[PDB]
């Protein structure tokens, strides 16, 4: 930024408020956010498993 003290900085960073998507299963950032008919999204690494174990319908923890 811009302050009297040259070389160092007070400590303020401007940014915009936004929302982040995380997998409620593995609790980690999902590279590719795949939105399910349920509404929420998940990580392929996770969806892939559920899809197999369950072929008929899909169960969601958030829902
Ligand atoms: Zn996951
Ligand atoms: Zn859901």
Swiss-Prot record:
May form oligomers. Interacts with isoform p52shc of SHC1. Auto-ubiquitinated (in vitro). Disulfide bonds: none annotated. E3 ubiquitin-protein ligase that acts as a regulator of antiviral immune response and inflammation by mediating ubiquitination of substrates. Acts as a regulator of innate immune defense against viruses by mediating 'Lys-63'-linked ubiquitination of MAVS, promoting MAVS polymerization and formation of three-stranded helical filaments on mitochondria. Acts as a negative regulator of the NLRP3 inflammasome by catalyzing 'Lys-48'-linked ubiquitination of NLRP3, leading to its degradation. Regulator of Src-induced anchorage independent cell growth. This is E3 ubiquitin-protein ligase TRIM31. It comes from the Eukaryota. A zinc finger (RING-type) spans 23-63. Belongs to the TRIM/RBCC family. Up-regulated in gastric adenocarcinomas. It is found in: Cytoplasm; Mitochondrion.
